Design a protein around this ligand. Sequence first.
Ligand SMILES: Nc1ncnc2c1ncn2[C@H]1C[C@H](O)[C@@H](COP(=O)(O)O)O1
Ligand SMILES: Nc1ncnc2c1ncn2[C@H]1C[C@H](O)[C@@H](COP(=O)(O)O)O1
Lengths: 104, 517, 103
Amino acid sequence: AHSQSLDRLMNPLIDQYLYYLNRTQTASGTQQSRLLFSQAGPTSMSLQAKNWLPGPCYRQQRLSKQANDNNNSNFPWTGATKYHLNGRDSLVNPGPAMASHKDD
Amino acid sequence: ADGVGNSSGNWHCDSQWLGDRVITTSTRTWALPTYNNHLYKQISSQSGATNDNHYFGYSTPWGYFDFNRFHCHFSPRDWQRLINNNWGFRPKRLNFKLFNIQVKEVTQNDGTTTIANNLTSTVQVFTDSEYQLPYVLGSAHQGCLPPFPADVFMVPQYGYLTLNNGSQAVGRSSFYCLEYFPSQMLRTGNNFQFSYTFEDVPFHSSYAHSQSLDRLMNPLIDQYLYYLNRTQTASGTQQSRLLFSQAGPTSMSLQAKNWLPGPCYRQQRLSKQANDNNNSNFPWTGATKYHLNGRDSLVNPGPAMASHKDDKEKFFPMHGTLIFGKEGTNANNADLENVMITDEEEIRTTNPVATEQYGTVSNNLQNSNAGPTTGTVNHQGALPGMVWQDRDVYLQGPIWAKIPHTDGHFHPSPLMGGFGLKHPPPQIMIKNTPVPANPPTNFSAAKFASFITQYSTGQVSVEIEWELQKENSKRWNPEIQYTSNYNKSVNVDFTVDTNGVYSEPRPIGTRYLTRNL
Amino acid sequence: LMGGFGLKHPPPQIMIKNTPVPANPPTNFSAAKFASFITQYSTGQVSVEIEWELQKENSKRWNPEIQYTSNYNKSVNVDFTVDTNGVYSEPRPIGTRYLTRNL
Ligand SMILES: Nc1ncnc2c1ncn2[C@H]1C[C@H](O)[C@@H](COP(=O)(O)O)O1
Ligand SMILES: Nc1ncnc2c1ncn2[C@H]1C[C@H](O)[C@@H](COP(=O)(O)O)O1
């Protein structure tokens, strides 16, 4: 298993030399359209430039193990994710590799 | 094996052109402080940060050397030679040296500082050959060798991130003690060296295409393949009928074609002219972003896509290009005039426009009763028969990145630019060996917090051998070249000013020479 | 036109400078360039050895030629010599043309 997230490969100490667009609007005074740029750094990591993208996704429905949390209706077939091949629907099972759940 | 009074190396900055290859050398002076009092410290995002910005990691006393920017290795003139005369270039092998090390001890008495040579003090250097440490190089951080040889730079501190949950740390979080790697210890008179050889990697494209992807046809000749010209009768009472025709010079858009444009993931469009853009704040809200483990992250700059369509120079995609600051620019809220926004325009011929949809698809099944409706595709993954160009490399910009070790990678070319490498040039780590201050005269098992304040300086050389791909073109008319403006000016471009400050006025891409598809 | 030997490949230029030595860097990384240097200078020794080729006088001239001579008369200072305060001085410019040849 990996010891790093894909978006965290950065050096947390050092600030980038590449600018990003911080503000599309003036900060103070009468609100006005203006373009403002900044170097992304330790404080905001989500904004930095990155070399890589996550793997491809084909989305799944989410179920809850705790009883009574899931919706009340029968949808294994109807609400599922499925591929349509030669006029026949078929479930995508288990499907492309995708993490089962997010943090916590 | 030299001693105090013998220089351990010489200054080599030159570049030499063999015409098959170019060998570019850069020698610079550096200064390494003592980071965070010789201590490994964990670092984590402050609580109250947004979910997306949390991190957990470790900051180390070690520094490191990064030459990963191009202008480290190329002068603006050497860059001009390359991009003008060549269709492609790739790195072959590099050679690295540290020499003329000096370790200075610093005392402070009242308001006066005193710096003196510590002749017996040591500096530690190891290269990570086996890629066992986190690799922070390809993230386009500051701290690379300066553009201009006469500058002295400060060695950046090494720290790394690992898994987190919120701001806390899951049990898989790795801690790496760099003091656990065999490292060479140097005094004044000792020098460090290693060699490296790049793995086979595709040449970068130094060319722009002379043809659009959809124009590869012979304009004179008519096809033998029919297409559907009319779904309805031309004259008289309108009636459903199917009519076919051979596509030809008059209508090119209708012809059969063998290839499709590269994959698109769409960008928002911004206008450089003030007051043309919407009035609201949407860098974060209206952006294009990927959602990974419950955290949103911008797609920046993103898949290579043309910046703008024909005759629309003013607009640029939001978060879709590399942006460089002009000299003296603030790191916070710089005006549009201060930044330098790069342009991908050369890739129009294949890649889609970053701000435009990929195309259109039909979302229903027609019949006599239900008219055909069609959906708009704003994102498209790879389809058989796609062709695309990679993003261009600039004079200042990433040379390489490390392809993450994973089960699968698709077209592993860094999205900022450059050469994707599975075994990138190793990380060179450096720190000042701790020197204690006077211990107590009675044994205490507590750890020393008392150290002699000191730093070290020295010289660093990087010699990379670049392989070139010559222009074979038969093009009759003159190609575009990168030229300096002839008109007079107060300052000369790519030159120091009156105050001694080196500045780069514009980003320079590598794509000038033209090839056919 | 000032004088001497026109050369297409004249003796090369010898350049010298003191390698910069930084002063104590900050303890937190900053990408700004160092303005803080240790003030220092260097001294040393320099030798220049040139080998000059000569062309001898072949003349048949009977009578004595002009030569460059020092004045015999007494003086407070001697020409081309330090003074009481240690200052070297050259009293007059000396051209090279004394010996005579025919056209
Ligand atoms: N930047 C980069 N690094 C590594 N591998 C890459 C890169 N870009 C593409 N590829 C892969 C996918 C290409 O079809 C193939 C060309 O390898 P060739 O050498 O041309 O035979 O290599
Ligand atoms: N100062 C100086 N440098 C170089 N060339 C000169 C100079 N003066 C004259 N010339 C040229 C023109 C002369 O006719 C010729 C004599 O070269 P000779 O060697 O005598 O055959 O060389």
